[PDB]
Structures are given as structure tokens and as C-alpha cells.
Amino acid sequence: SAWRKAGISYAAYLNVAAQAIRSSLKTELQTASVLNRSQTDAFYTQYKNGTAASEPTPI
Amino acid sequence: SSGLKLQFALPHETLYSGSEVTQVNLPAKSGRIGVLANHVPTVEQLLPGVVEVMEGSNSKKFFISGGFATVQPDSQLCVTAIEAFPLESFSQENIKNLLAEAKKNVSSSDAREAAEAAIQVEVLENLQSVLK
Amino acid sequence: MQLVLAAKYIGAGISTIGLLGAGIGIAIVFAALINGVSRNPSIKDTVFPMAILGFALSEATGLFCLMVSFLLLFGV
Amino acid sequence: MQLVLAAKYIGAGISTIGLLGAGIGIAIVFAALINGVSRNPSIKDTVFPMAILGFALSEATGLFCLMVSFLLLFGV
Amino acid sequence: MQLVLAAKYIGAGISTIGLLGAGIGIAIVFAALINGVSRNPSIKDTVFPMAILGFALSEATGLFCLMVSFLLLFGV
Amino acid sequence: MQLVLAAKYIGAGISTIGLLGAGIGIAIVFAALINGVSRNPSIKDTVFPMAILGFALSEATGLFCLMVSFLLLFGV
Amino acid sequence: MQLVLAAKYIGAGISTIGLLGAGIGIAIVFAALINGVSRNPSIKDTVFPMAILGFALSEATGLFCLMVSFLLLFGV
Amino acid sequence: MQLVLAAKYIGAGISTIGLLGAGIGIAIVFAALINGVSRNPSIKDTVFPMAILGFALSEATGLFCLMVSFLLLFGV
Amino acid sequence: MQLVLAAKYIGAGISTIGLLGAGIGIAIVFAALINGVSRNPSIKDTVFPMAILGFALSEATGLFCLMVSFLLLFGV
Amino acid sequence: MQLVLAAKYIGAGISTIGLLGAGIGIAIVFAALINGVSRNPSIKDTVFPMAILGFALSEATGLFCLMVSFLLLFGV
Amino acid sequence: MQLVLAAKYIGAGISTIGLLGAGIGIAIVFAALINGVSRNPSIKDTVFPMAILGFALSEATGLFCLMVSFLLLFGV
Amino acid sequence: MQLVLAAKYIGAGISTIGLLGAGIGIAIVFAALINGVSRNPSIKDTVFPMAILGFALSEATGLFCLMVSFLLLFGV
Fold first, then answer.
1. Burial F26-45 (b: 16+ CB within 10 A, else e)
2. I want to staple K11 with a disulfide (CB 3.0 to 4.6 A). Which of F27, G7, G24, L9 is the partner?
3. DSSP letters along D45-62, please?
4. Is B88 in a helix, a strand, or coil?
5. Spatial separation of the C-alpha atoms in residues B25 and B13, rounded to whole Å
6. E72, G26: Cβ pair inside 8 Å?
7. One GO CC term of this entry (chain B)?
8. Which phi-psi region, left, alpha or beta, contains residue B18 (left: φ > 0; alpha: ψ -120 to 50)?
9. Is residue L58 classed exposed, middle or buried when 0-12, 13-18 and 19+ CB atoms within 10 A define those classes?
10. What is the DSSP letter of F8?
């Protein structure tokens, strides 16, 4: 269950718990503020030294 | 200078800010820790557990996601986390088991995704003990 | 019999030295339970039962050496 | 009786050495409660009661070796 | 036989001193399991089994020195 | 009486060895109070009182072994 | 032979004191494996094998002093 | 008197062994003050006074066993 | 020769007590390697080799005191 | 005088055992100063002076037991 | 000569007990180097050389007490 | 002279036991320097010099008890 071994950064270690918690509550007391708070549509792309780039992927 | 000023804030909402507290109980990596008025400056990493702010009056207890805790020399503890959770009237046993069980099936799914499942198991199990 | 009788008392006072293993031994085993709950108050009905198991294991040295003294005073 | 009587005093002074287990033993058990409460003041009425339980367990070595001395001075 | 018989009791009370290794020894081995499970409740059915293995290893010193006392009281 | 009288002094000098439990024992118990309040000076009127309680518990080994010496010099 | 025979039993009960190194020794070596896996569950098939190697090294003191007792009771 | 006089010197050299409790004991008590102020320079006039109190408590074992030697050399 | 022969067995059983340094000694040296590879698995082929070097250093006390027993049983 | 003279040498070699309190004792007291300044070089002219004070306190056990040997070799 | 010769073997088996300081002593000194590189591998050619210096210092107790045994078996 | 001469060897083998304070003592003092640099290499020419000072302080117990053996073998 190592997180800093083959898991993710400490920022992600607390992240998984943030969504798990926010999703472990009542569905009635779950404002839309929390919904979009766990939603993201950002993609990252690695570039080279010659303006080159890698295949786009989801964060 | 009497008491200790608490600063419990989140990336979406701030609860306490320069407020005097009698005692606080927040889980640390090394182990469960407590703080009072005058306390030695310690900087420990907070793990997914349960925090409780104490007052002369009945003390409230909220569930924390995790982060860091630092007690400033000038008698000032600062708690930083992501999400927060009220007493028990917020979480539901039924809403937890649904995903909880699905987590054990994530180990069955590809490891890339099962890696995060192992981390969920722990947090979820602790949620059950909060029911008390 | 007099010379051999005197050795019964000398040997009984030395067999008590072997009981240190139960004084300091059980101390450490029990002390861990005290320092464990301070680091994790959650787990209690899991470490407490096993802690008692360690007691009977360390109590052994406090029984054997204890019987040796009786086998030299009220035994022989 | 004289040679066997002398062994009663020699054996009594050695059975006191076995009482070290209660001096250092109970020390560690009690010391853990001090290092525990200074790290988690909340859990007091939980570690304090069990701490006393460890006392009687470590006090054993301080009773057995204590009785051995009386069985050589006021007993025999 | 009288002078050699007396040495049977003196040697038996000293062989009990060697049993300290089992009192304090097994204590540390068992104490580690308590400090471990109070820091990592996940791994239980992995450290518990090996912990017992360490018991029989440290129980050795508590058996050999224990047999030596019988070979001087009920043996010879 | 001469041979038995000599054993009164030999047994008295050995019963002082059992007082080590009070020297090192009380040391650890008191040392914990020093390290405890070094990390949390606020809690004081809670660990200080219990610390004294541990003193009388560890002082036991320093009284029993102390009385044994008087029962061989000014007692018998 | 009687005076020299009696020394065979006295010397055998003292050679058991040397077995403390195996009781407390192996305890610490095994205890480290318990405190290592509870803090690093990842590495197991690496520390476990070497841990056993330390056993035979500390078991030495528990064999030599063990043979000395047989060379005074069933040897000489 | 000659046989009983010789026991006065043998018993005096053994009562010095009981002074180990003051050497190692006071050491730990004083050592805690050193490891306390190096981690919390703030508090000083609070741990220093109590530290001295622990001295007289651990100095006890260094006085009793010290008087026993004089009661066998310059006393009796 | 009989009185001097008996001292050969008494002295051999005491020279085994000096072997405690190898039991507990090598234990601590090996235990450090276990505690070191739990917080830093990276450094292995650096601490492992030096760890063995510490073995031969602590094994010294387990050889000298071991030879002394043979110089009283199969030597003299 | 011959039997009582021999006890002067036997009692002098035992009073040296009480000097362990100064060897290990002063060691811990001085060792704390080393682990202290490292973790906090800021405080030096505050812990250094008190550290020396602990020396004379632990040096006591190394003086009393030291004088006992002279009162059996060059005293009596 | 027979009574004085026997004391040569008894005194040689006791001088081996003083070699514990080299077994456990060198152990701690070497163990620190292991726990040190695991915390800071950056500093190696600085702590390693001084570590060896501590060896010869602790090896002293393992040489003096070692020579005492030869001065009673192959010396006198 | 024969009975008193034999006590010269018995007392010399016991005075070596007092040298444990230098083996384990100097070990802890030197070990602190190793664990101190692993946490803060900034302070080297400050802790190193004082570390040597602690050596001569702990070396005391290794000199006094060392001289006692010569005053029973090459002295008297």
C-alpha cells in the first residue's frame, strides 16, 4: 500500500482522500459546488527542443 | 499571551482563523498528537484521520482529509487540509459501502488504477470507526 | 546432615536472581501497550489481547526460577 | 546448629538482588504513562487504568523475592 | 556423599540466572509486535506469525538453563 | 557464636545490591517527567502528581532491601 | 574423588549464565525485523533472509556456553 | 576475634556495588535535562528546578549503600 | 592433585559469562542493519559489507572467552 | 594475622565493580550534550556549564567506591 | 603448592567477565555508523575514519582484561 | 604464606569486572558523536573536541580498576 513508492506525490495522496470523503457523504447535502470541485477536463502534452510534442493525454 | 490561536483552513472554505483554542487532537504520521495553550514548536504531517477542536464548552469533532500541522513558536497552531467533514449527520454508512466494496474490485482491475484503491481502503475503514 | 543443608539456603537465595527476567521483561512488554495506544488510540481490542499473551510468555521465567527456590526450602 | 544457621543470613542477602526487577521494571511501565500522556492528553482514563494493571504484574517479582528473605530470617 | 551433594543445590540456584535471557529477550521480541501494529494495523497476518517464530528462538535459552536445574535436583 | 556472626556482615553487604532498582528505577520515572514537559510545558499539574506516585512505587525496592541490612546489623 | 566432583556441578550452573547473550541478543535481532516491516512493508524477502543469518551468529553464544555445561555433567 | 573481623572487609567491598544506582541513575535524570533544553530552549527555569529534585531522590541509593560501608569499616 | 583440579571446572563455567558480549553485542550491530534497510533500501551494498566487518570485531569477545574454557578443560 | 589479611584483597577487587556507575553514568550525561548541540547549536554556553555540573554528581560514585579500595590496601 | 595454584584458574575465569565491555561497547559504537549512513549517506569518508578510532578506544577493555587471564594461566 | 597469596589472584580477576564502565561507557559517548554528525555536519570542530574530553572522563573507570589488578599481581 506504499504511496511514495509506486503510488503518487503527497498532493495526490491527500487528493484521493479528498474525493473519497466528498463522495462518502449524503447525496442530499452535496451542493453542485462539490460536484465540479471533483471534475476536471485538462490534458497535458510534453514538448521537445524543436517545438515537437508527444501524444496528448488526460491529467 | 494566553491560549493558542488556531488557523484551520481549506482550499475552498476557512473554518478557524486566529481563534483561541483550549485543546486539539489531530492524527500525525508519528502517531496521534495533542496540543494545548503552550506547546513546543513541532511540524508533523497529518494523515487521513479525525480532528477535534476542544473548547470550554462542548467540543466539536470533524473528519480531516490530510495535510500538515505546525505549531508556531508564538503559540499558534496551523492546520492545513483539503476537504472537511462534519460530525456524523453528513456521512452515511450506505453511501460508503457502495464505493468501499467497489474498491476491493479495483485491485481486480488494472494495477495502474488499483494503486489508488489501496489508499482508499484505509481512509474508508477509518470512516466506519467514526460512527462510534 | 549439616554441610549439605546449609547449601540449601545459599542456593535458594541465588535462584531469586533469575526472577529479574520477569520484572524487567514483563515491564517492557506492558510498556509497549502504553506507548502504542498513544500513537494509535483506534486499535485497542487488538493489541490488548495479544499483550496479555506476552505476559504468560514472560511470566515463565518468573515461575521456573520461583519453583527452584521452593525445591530448596520446602522441597529438596 | 551453627554452620547451617550462617547460611540463612547469606542466602537472605542474595534474595534481595532479585528485587531489581521491580525497581527498574515498574519504572519503565510507569515511565511509559508519562511519555504517553505528554503526547496525547485526551486518552487518560484509558491508559491510566491499564497502567496500574501492569504494576501488579511487575510487583510480582518484588513480592516473591521479598518472601524468600523472610523464609530465611523469620521463617526457615 | 555429603560435600558433593551440597554442590548440587548451589549449582541449581545459579543455573536459574541464565533464564533472564528468556524474560527480557522474549519481552523485546513481543514488544516490537506491539509497537508495529500500533503504527501499521494493515500488516497483521504477516508480522504476527513471524513474531511467534522469534518466541521459540528466544525460548531456547529458557529451556536449556531450565533443564540444567533438573539435572542437579532430579537428575545428577 | 563467631562463625554465624560473620555471616551477618557478609549478608548485609549483599542486600545493598538490591538497592540498584531504586537508583536507576526512580531515575527513569523522573527522567520521563523531564522529557515529557520539554515537549509540552502546558500539561504540568497532571503529569507531575502522577510522577510522584511512581516514586513511592519504585521506592519500595529501596525500602525492603534497606530493611534487610538492618535485620543483619542492628536486628538479627 | 569427591571434592573435585562437587566442582563439576558448581561450574555447570555458572556456565548457564553465559546463555543470556542468546536470549536478549536474538531478541534484539528479531525485534528489528518486526520494527522494520511495520514501517516498510515493501521490503520483506530482503530483510527476512538476512535476519535469519543474524540468528545463527547470535545462536553461537547459546551453543558454546551450552556445551560447557555438558562437559561438566555428561563429559568431564 | 579474627574470622568475624575478616567478614567486615568482605561485606564492605560488596556494599559498594549498590552505588551503581546513583552513577547510572543520576546520569539518566540529568541527561533528560540536556535533551530537553536542546529541543525547547524556551522552558528552563521550570525543568531545571525539578531536575535537581530528582537528584536527591536518586542520591538516596548513593547514601544508604555508602553508609553501609562505614558501618563495616569505621562502625560495626 | 584434586583441590587444584576442581578449580579447573569452576573457572571454566565462569569464563562462559564473558561470552555475553558476543550475544548482545553482535545483536545490536546486526539489528542496526535491519533498521537501516527499512528507512533506506537504496544503500544496501554499502552498509551490508561494513556490517560484516563489525561482526568479526564483536566476535572477538566470543572467541577469547571461548578459548579460556578450553584452557581449563582440554588444556591447562 | 593471615586469614583476615586475605579478605583485604578480596574485598578490594569487589569494590571496583561499584565504579561502573561512573563509566556508564558519566557517559550518558556527556552523550546528551553531544546529541543536544547537534540538534541545536544555538544553545551552547547554557548546556555546557550545566553538563559539567552533572559530571561531579556522577563522579561521586567513582570516588566513594574508589576510596573503599584504598581502605583495604593502603588503609585498613 | 596446590591451594594457591587452584586460585590461578578461578581468577582467570572471572577476568573474562570484564570483556563484556568490548562486546557490547564496540557494538554500540559500530551500530551508530550503521544508523548514521542510513540517515545521511553524504557523509561517509568522515564518520567512517572516526568510527575506527572509537574501536581502539573500546578495544582497550578487551585487551587489559584479556591479558589478566594470561597472567594467571601462562604467566603468574 | 599460601592462603593469603591465593586471595591475590581471586581479587585480581574480580577487579576486571569494574572495567565494563569503560567499554560500554566510552561506547555511548563516542556513539553520540556519530549520531550527531548524521543530523548536522555543520558542527564538527565543536563537538569533536568536547567528545575527546568525555573520553578521558570515562577512561577514569578503566584506569582505576586497571591499577587494582596490578596491585594484586605485580604489586601487593
1. bbbbbbbbbbbbbbbbbbbe
2. L9
3. TTHHHHHHHHHHHHSSHH
4. coil
5. 20
6. no
7. mitochondrial inner membrane
8. left
9. buried
10. H
| Distance in angstroms (rounded) separating the CA atoms of residues H39 and B41 | 9
With CA atoms as reference, report the closest residue to L27 among F44, E39, K28.
Answer: K28
Resolution (A): 37.0
**Nine cell digits for residue J14:** 569487589
How far apart CA K67 and CA I17 sit, in angstroms, is 17
C-alpha cell belonging to residue G5: 566432583
Reduced DSSP (H G I as helix, E B as strand, rest coil) percent helix, strand, coil of chain A, to 5: 35, 10, 55
From the CB of residue K7, how many other CB atoms can be counted at a distance below 10 Å?
Answer: 24
By the 10 Å C-beta count (0-12 exposed, 13-18 middle, 19+ buried), J18 is classed as buried
**Substitution target from I9, I26, I63 for chain G, most G beta carbons within 10 A:** I9
CA distance K23 to K13: 17
Using CA atoms, how far apart are residues K15 and L73, in angstroms rounded to an integer? Answer: 13
CA-closest candidate to residue H9, choices J62, J73, L19: J73
**Residue B34 pairs with which residues in a beta bridge?**
B25
C-alpha cell at C29: 512488554
The total of other beta-carbon atoms located within 10 Å of residue E50's CB is 17
Q: In which element (H, E) is residue J68 found?
A: helix J61-73
Tell me which DSSP letter residue J76 carries: -
Cell of D29: 511501565
The amino acid present at F50, given as its one-letter code, is M
Domains of chain I, earliest start first: 2-75 (1.20.20.10)
Measured between CA atoms, the residue of chain B closest to residue F39 is B40
Sheet holding B32-35, edge to edge: B32-35, B23-27, B50-54, B60-64, B84-85
Using the 8-state DSSP alphabet, how is residue B91 labeled?
A: B
Element (H, E) at B43: strand B43-46
Cα–Cα dist B39/B24, whole Å: 11
Number of H helices, E strands in chain J: 4, 0
Q: How far apart are CA G58 and CA E14, in angstroms?
A: 23
Helices C20-37 and D20-37: angle between axes, nearest 10 degrees: 10
Cα-based torsion angle of the residue sequence H7, H10, H16, H21 in order, rounded to the nearest 10 degrees: -80
Provide the grid cell at B105.
474490485
- Chain G CB contacts of I34 under 8 Å are 29, 32-33, 36, 47, 50-51, 54
Q: With contact defined as beta carbons under 8 Å apart, do J52 and J29 qualify?
A: no
The CA distance from J72 to J8, in Å, is 5
Mutate to test the interface with F, among H68, H70, H74 (most CBs of F within 10 A): H68
Contact A21 B96 (CB under 8 A): no
Q: Which chain C residues are closer than 8 Å to D33 by Cβ?
A: 34
Cα–Cα nearest to E42, from B121, I35, C50, B116: B121
Breaks (C-N over 2.5 A) in chain E follow: none
CA distance L15 to L65: 6
Q: J15, J75 in Cβ contact below 8 A? A: no
Amino acid at C8: K
Q: How many CB atoms lie within 10 A of CB E14?
A: 28
C-beta of residue J72 within 8 angstroms of C-beta of residue J18: no
Contact E62, C60 (CB under 8 A): yes
J/I Cβ contact: 3+ pairs below 8 Å: no
Handedness of CA B105, B107, B108, B113 (dihedral sign): positive
Please, after which residues is chain G broken with C–N above 2.5 Å?
none
| Cα(F67)–Cα(B92) distance, integer angstroms | 65
H43: closest chain B residue by CA? B40
Assign B8 to helix, strand or coil: strand
CA-to-CA distance for L34 and H12, rounded, in angstroms?
A: 40
**B40 CB-side CA count, 13 A:** 22
